[PDB]
Amino acid sequence: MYQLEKEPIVGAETFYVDGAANRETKLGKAGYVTNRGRQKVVTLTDTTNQKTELQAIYLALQDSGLEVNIVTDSQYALGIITQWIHNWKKRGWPVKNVDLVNQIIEQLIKKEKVYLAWVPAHKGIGGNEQVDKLVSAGIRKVL
Numbered sequence: 001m002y003q004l005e006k007e008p009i010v011g012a013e014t015f016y017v018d019g020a021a022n023r024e025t026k027l028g029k030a031g032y033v034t035n036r037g038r039q040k041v042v043t044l045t046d047t048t049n050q051k052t053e054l055q056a057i058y059l060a061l062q063d064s065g066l067e068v069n070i071v072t073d074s075q076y077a078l079g080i081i082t083q084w085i086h087n088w089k090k091r092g093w094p095v096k097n098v099d100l101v102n103q104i105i106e107q108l109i110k111k112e113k114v115y116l117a118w119v120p121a122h123k124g125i126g127g128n129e130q131v132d133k134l135v136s137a138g139i140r141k142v143l
């Protein structure tokens with residue numbers, strides 16, 4: 001893949017990703033739930049909300065087939081990734097989380113097709129609410 005899909009890929013698994021991190025303990029979780037009934041969560045040490053969001057996208061790319069829809073609510077993650085795929089297109093190959101954004105880009109290009117979309121957090125979107133509950137458990141006191 002060298003460019004993202006403009007629209008959802010019909011017949012491809014859709015991953016709803018999210019991450020949460022505790023400001024005090026710096027413990028966090030990254031994870032996904034999919035429309036095919038799969039879930040995964042991993043716990044991360046010494047992490048940040050932004051890092052968990054990138055890690056969740058990495059997990060979705062690792063565990064998905066060659067065509068995949070990924071729905072994030074992270075403005076940062078979508079922004080920093082998008083900035084890469086556009087750069088690539090016009091300038092060719094970030095300061096924070098550089099190793100991780102690179103791992104993600106290297107995953108993306110090996111896919112056949114990827115649709116990556118943003119939705120607003122805590123607005124009742126079903127898959128998104130489910131994964132948020134998963135990664136926030138034991139991490140985020142209250143909303």
Ligand SMILES: O=C(O)c1nc(Cc2ccc(Cl)c(Cl)c2)nc(O)c1O
Pocket residue numbers: 018019053073074075121122132143
């Ligand atoms: O990725 C995020 O940026 C993200 N941002 C928030 C903050 C937020 C957003 C909307 C509402 Cl309505 C509230 Cl109360 C808090 N929470 C999350 O769980 C989350 O994943």
Ligand SMILES: [Mn+2]
Pocket residue numbers: 018019053073074121
């Ligand atoms: Mn989020």
Ligand SMILES: [Mn+2]
Pocket residue numbers: 018019020121132
């Ligand atoms: Mn969340």
